PDB file of C-alpha atoms and ligand atoms in Angstrom:
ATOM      1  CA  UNK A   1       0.000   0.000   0.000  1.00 33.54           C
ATOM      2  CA  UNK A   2       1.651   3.352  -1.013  1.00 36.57           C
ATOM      3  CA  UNK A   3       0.087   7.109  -0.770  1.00 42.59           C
ATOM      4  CA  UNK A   4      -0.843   8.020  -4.545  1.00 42.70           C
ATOM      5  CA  UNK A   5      -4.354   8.969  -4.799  1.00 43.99           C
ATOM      6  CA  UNK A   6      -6.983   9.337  -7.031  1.00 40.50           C
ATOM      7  CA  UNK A   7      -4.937   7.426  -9.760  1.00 39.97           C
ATOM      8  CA  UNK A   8      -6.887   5.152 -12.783  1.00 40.80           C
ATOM      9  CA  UNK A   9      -4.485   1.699 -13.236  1.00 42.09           C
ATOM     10  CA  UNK A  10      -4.006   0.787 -16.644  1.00 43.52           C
ATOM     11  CA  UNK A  11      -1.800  -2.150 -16.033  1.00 44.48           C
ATOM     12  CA  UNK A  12      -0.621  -4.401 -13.512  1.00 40.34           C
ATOM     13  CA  UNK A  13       2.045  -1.772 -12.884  1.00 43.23           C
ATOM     14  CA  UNK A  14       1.310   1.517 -14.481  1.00 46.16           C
ATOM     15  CA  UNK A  15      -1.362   3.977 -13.270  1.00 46.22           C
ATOM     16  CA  UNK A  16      -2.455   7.897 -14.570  1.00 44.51           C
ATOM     17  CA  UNK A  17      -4.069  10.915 -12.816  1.00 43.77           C
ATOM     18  CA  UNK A  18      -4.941  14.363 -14.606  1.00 45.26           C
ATOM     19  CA  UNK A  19      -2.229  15.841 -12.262  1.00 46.32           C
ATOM     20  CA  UNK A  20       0.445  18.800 -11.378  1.00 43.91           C
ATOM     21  CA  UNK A  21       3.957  16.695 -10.785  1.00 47.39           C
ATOM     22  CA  UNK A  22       4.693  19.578  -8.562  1.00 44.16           C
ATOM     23  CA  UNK A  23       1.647  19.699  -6.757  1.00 42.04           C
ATOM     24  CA  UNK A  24       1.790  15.806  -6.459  1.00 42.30           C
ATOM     25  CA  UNK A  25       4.834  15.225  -5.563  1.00 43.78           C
ATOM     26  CA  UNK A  26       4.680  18.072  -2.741  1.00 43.32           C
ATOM     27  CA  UNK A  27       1.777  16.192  -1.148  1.00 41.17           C
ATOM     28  CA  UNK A  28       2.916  12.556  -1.632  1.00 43.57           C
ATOM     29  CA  UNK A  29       7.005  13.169  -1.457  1.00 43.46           C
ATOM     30  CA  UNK A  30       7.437  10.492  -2.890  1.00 45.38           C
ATOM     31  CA  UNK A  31      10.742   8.088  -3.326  1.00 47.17           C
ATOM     32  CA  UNK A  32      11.473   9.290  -6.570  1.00 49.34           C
ATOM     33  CA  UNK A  33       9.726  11.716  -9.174  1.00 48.88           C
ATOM     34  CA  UNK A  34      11.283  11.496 -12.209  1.00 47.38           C
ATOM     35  CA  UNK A  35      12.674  14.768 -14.318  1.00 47.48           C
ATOM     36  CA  UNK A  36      12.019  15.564 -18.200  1.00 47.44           C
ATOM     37  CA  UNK A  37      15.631  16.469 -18.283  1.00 45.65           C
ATOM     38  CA  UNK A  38      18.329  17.078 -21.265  1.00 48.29           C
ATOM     39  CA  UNK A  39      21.597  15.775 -21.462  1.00 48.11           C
ATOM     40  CA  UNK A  40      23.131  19.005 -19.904  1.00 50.25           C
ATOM     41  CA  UNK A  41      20.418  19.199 -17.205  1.00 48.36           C
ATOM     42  CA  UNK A  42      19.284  22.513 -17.696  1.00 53.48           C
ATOM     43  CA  UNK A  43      16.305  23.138 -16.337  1.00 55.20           C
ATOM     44  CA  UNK A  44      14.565  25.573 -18.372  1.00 56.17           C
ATOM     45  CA  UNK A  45      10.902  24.973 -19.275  1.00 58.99           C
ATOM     46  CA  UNK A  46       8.479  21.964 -19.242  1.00 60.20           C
ATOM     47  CA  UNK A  47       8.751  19.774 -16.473  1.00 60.99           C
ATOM     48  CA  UNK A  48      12.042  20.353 -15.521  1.00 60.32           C
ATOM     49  CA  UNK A  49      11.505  24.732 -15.580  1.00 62.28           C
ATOM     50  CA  UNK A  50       9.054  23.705 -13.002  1.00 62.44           C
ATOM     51  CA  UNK A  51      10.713  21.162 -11.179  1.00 59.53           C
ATOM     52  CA  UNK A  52      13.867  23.269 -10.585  1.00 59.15           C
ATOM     53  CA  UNK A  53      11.447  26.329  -9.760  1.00 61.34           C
ATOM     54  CA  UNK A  54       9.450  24.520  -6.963  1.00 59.72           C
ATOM     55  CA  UNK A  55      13.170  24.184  -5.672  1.00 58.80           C
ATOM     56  CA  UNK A  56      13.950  27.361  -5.656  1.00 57.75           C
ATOM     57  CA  UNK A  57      16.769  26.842  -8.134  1.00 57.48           C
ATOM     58  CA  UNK A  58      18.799  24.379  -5.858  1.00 58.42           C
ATOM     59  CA  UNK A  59      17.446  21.795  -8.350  1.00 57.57           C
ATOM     60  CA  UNK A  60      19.978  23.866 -10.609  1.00 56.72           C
ATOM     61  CA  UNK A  61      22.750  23.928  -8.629  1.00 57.75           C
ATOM     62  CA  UNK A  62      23.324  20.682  -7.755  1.00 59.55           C
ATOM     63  CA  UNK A  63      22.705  20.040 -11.580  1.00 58.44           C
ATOM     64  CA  UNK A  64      25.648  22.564 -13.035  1.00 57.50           C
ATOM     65  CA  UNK A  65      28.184  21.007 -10.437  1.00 58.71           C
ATOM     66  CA  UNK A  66      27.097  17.519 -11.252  1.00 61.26           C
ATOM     67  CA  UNK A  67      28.007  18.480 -15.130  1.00 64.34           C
ATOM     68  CA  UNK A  68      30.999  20.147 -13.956  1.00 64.71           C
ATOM     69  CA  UNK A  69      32.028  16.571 -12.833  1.00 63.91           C
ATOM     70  CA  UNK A  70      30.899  14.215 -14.639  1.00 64.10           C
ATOM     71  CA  UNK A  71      29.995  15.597 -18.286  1.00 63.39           C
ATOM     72  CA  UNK A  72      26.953  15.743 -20.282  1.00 66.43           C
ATOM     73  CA  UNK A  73      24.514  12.505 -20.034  1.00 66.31           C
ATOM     74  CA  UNK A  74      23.417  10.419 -22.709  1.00 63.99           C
ATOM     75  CA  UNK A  75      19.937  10.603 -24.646  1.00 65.15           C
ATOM     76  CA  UNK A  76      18.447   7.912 -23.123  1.00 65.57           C
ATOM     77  CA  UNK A  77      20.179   7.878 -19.796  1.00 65.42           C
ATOM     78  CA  UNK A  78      19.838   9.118 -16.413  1.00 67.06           C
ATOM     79  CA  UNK A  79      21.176  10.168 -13.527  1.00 66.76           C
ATOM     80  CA  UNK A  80      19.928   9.994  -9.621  1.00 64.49           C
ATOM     81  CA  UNK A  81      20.306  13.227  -8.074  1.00 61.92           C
ATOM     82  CA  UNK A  82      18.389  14.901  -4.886  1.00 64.13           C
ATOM     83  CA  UNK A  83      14.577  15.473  -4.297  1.00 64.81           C
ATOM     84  CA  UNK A  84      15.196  18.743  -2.935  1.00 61.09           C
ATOM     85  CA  UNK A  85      11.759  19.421  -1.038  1.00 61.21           C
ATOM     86  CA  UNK A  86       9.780  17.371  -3.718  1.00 62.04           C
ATOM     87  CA  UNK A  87      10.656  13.930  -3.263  1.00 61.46           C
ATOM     88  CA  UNK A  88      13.655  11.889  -1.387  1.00 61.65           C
ATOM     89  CA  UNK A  89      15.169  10.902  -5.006  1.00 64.01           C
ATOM     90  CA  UNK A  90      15.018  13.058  -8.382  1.00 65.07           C
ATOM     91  CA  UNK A  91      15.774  10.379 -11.081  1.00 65.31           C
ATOM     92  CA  UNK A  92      16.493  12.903 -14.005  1.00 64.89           C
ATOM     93  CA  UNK A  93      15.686  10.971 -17.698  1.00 62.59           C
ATOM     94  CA  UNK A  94      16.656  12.513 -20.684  1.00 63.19           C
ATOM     95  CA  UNK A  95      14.090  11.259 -23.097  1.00 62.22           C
ATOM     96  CA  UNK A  96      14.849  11.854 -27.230  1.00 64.36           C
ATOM     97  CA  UNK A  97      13.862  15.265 -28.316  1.00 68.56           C
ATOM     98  CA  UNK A  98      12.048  15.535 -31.343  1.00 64.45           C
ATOM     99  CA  UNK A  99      12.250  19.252 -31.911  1.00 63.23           C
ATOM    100  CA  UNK A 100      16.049  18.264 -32.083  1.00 62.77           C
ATOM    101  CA  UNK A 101      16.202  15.174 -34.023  1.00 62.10           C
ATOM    102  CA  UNK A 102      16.668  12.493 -32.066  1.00 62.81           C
ATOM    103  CA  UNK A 103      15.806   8.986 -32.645  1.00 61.67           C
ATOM    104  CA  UNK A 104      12.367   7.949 -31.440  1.00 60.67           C
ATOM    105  CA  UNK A 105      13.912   4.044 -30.392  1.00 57.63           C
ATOM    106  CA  UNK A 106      15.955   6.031 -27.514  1.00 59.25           C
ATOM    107  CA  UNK A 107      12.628   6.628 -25.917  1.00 60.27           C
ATOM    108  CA  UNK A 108      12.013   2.799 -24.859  1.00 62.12           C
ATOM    109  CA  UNK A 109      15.704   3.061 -23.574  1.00 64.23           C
ATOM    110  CA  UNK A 110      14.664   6.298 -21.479  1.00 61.49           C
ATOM    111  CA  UNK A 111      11.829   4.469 -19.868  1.00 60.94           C
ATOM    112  CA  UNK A 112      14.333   1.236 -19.022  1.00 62.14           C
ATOM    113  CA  UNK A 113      15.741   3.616 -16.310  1.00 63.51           C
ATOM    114  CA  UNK A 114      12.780   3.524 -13.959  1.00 63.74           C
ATOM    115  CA  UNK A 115      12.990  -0.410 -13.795  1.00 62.57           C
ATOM    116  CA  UNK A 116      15.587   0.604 -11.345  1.00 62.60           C
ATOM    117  CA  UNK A 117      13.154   1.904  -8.764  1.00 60.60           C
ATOM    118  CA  UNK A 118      10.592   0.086  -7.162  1.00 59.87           C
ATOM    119  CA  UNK A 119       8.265   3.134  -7.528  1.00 62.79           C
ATOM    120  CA  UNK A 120       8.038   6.625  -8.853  1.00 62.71           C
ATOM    121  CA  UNK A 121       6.351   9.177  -9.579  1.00 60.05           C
ATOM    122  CA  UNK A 122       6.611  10.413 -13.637  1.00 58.02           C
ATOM    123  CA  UNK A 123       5.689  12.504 -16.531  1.00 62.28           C
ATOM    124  CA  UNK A 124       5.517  10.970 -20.141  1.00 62.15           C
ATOM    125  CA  UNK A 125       8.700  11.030 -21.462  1.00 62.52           C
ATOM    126  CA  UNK A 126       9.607  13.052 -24.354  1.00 61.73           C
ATOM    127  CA  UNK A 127       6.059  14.239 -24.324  1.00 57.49           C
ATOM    128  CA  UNK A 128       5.593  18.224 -24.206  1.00 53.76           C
ATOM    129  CA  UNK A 129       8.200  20.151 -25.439  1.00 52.71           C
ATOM    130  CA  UNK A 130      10.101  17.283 -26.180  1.00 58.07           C
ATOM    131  CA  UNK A 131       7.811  16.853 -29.128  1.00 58.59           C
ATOM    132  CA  UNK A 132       7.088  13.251 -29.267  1.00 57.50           C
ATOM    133  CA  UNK A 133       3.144  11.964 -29.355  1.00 59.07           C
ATOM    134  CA  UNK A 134       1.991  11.240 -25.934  1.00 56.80           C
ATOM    135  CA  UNK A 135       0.036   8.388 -26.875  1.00 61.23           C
ATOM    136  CA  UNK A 136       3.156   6.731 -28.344  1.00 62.78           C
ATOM    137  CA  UNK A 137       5.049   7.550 -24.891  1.00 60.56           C
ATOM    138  CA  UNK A 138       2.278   6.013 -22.918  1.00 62.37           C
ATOM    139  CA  UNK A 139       2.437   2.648 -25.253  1.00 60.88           C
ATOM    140  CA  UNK A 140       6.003   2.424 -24.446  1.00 60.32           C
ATOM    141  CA  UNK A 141       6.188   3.048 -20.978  1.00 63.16           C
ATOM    142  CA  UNK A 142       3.582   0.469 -20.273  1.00 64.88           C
ATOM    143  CA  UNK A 143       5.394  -2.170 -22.699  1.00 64.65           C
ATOM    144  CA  UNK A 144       8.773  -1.161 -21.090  1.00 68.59           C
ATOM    145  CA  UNK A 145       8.387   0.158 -17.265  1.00 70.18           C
ATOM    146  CA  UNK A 146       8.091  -3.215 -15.025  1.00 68.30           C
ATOM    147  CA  UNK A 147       8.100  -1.496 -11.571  1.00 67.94           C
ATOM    148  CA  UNK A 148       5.399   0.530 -10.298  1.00 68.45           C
ATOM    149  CA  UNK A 149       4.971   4.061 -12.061  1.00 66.85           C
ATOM    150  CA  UNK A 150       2.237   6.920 -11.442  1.00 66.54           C
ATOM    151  CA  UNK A 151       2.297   9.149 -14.021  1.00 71.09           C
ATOM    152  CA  UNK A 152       0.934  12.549 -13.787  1.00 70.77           C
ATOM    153  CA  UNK A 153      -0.396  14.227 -17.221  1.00 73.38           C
ATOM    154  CA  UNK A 154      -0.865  18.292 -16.468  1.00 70.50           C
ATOM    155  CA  UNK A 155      -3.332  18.526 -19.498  1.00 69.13           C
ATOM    156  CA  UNK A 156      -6.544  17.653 -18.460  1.00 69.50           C
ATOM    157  CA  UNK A 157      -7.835  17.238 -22.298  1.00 74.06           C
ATOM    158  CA  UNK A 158      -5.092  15.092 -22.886  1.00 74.64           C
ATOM    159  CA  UNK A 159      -5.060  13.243 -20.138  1.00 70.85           C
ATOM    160  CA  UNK A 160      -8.842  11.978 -20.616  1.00 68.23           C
ATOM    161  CA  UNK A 161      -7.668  11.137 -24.612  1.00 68.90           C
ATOM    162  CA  UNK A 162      -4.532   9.142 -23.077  1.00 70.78           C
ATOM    163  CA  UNK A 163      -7.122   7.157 -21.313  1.00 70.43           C
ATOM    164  CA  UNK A 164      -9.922   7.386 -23.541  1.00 71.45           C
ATOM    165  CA  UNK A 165      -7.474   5.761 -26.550  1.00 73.22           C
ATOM    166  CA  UNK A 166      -5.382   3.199 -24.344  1.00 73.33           C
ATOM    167  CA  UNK A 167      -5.360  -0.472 -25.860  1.00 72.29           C
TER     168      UNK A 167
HETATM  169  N1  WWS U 201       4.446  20.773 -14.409  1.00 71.49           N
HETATM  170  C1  WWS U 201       4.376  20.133 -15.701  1.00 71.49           C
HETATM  171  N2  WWS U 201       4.737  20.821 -16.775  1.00 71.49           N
HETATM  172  C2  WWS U 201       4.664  20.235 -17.980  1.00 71.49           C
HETATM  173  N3  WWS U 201       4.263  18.968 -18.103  1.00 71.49           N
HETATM  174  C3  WWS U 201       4.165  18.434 -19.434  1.00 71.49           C
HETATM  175  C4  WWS U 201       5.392  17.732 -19.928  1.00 71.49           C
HETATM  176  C5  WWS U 201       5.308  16.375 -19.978  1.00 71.49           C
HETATM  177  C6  WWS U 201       6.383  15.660 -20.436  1.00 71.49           C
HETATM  178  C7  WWS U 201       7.511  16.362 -20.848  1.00 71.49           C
HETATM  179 CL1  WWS U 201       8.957  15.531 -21.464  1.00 71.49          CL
HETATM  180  C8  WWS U 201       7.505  17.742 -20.777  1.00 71.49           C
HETATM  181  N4  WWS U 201       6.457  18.380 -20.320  1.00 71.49           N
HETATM  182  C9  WWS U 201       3.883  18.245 -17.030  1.00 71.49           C
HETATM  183  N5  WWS U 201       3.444  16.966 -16.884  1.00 71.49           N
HETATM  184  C10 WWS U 201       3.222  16.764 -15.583  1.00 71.49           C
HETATM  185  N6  WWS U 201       3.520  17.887 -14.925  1.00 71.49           N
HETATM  186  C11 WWS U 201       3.944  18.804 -15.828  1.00 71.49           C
END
């Protein structure tokens, strides 16, 4: 028994809410909430602007000297990094971009990262800004993500189509 509410399962394993992943991961603090992030972490917009803004920026700073050290991450990868005041864990995922190119097939590598954590809390990667079609996201994250995910979907319109159009 775990603390996400108001959720609609899908799957064994994979559950959606109409929800703020700021908002939600305030109230439940969860484990882990997973970041939209890019390879250089820079937390601009989407997700991640807000993410790093509910942190007051120290989302940011522990980013820039985690770069300083270790480099740029790969599309596809990930990196574990603090929760700040959101969540114990922040498991930042950089999913392919599509408004830059990259290759769509990254985005079931992406999702292979949260098999490392029992459960999280997530947004649909490479959804957004990131350009990709949400309802291909959701397809892969159910056919990839083994371990227990809650994904929160800001848009309340698409939300109820990811729902209303799940196979
Ligand atoms: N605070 C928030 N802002 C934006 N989105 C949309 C979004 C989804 C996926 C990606 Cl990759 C980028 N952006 C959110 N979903 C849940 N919470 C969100």
């Amino acid at each position: 028994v775990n603390s996400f509410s108001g959720y609609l399962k899908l799957t064994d394993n994979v559950y959606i809410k109409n929800a703020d992943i700021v908002e939600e991961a305030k109230k439940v603090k969860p484990t882990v909430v997973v970041n939209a992030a890019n390879v250089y972490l820079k937390h601009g917009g989407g997700v991640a602007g807000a993410l790093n803004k509910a942190t007051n920026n120290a989302m940011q700073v522990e980013s820039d000297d985690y770069i300083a050290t270790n480099g740029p991450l790969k599309v596809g990868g990930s990196c574990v990094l603090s929760g700040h005041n959101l969540a114990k864990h922040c498991l930042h995922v950089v999913g392919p971009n599509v408004n830059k190119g990259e290759d769509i097939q990254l985005l079931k590598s992406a999702y292979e990262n949260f098999n490392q954590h029992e459960v999280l809390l997530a947004p649909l990667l490479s959804a957004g800004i990131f350009g990709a079609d949400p309802i291909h996201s959701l397809r892969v994250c159910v056919d990839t993500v083994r371990t227990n995910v809650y994904l929160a979907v800001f848009d309340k319109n698409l939300y109820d189509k990811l729902v209303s159009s799940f196979l």
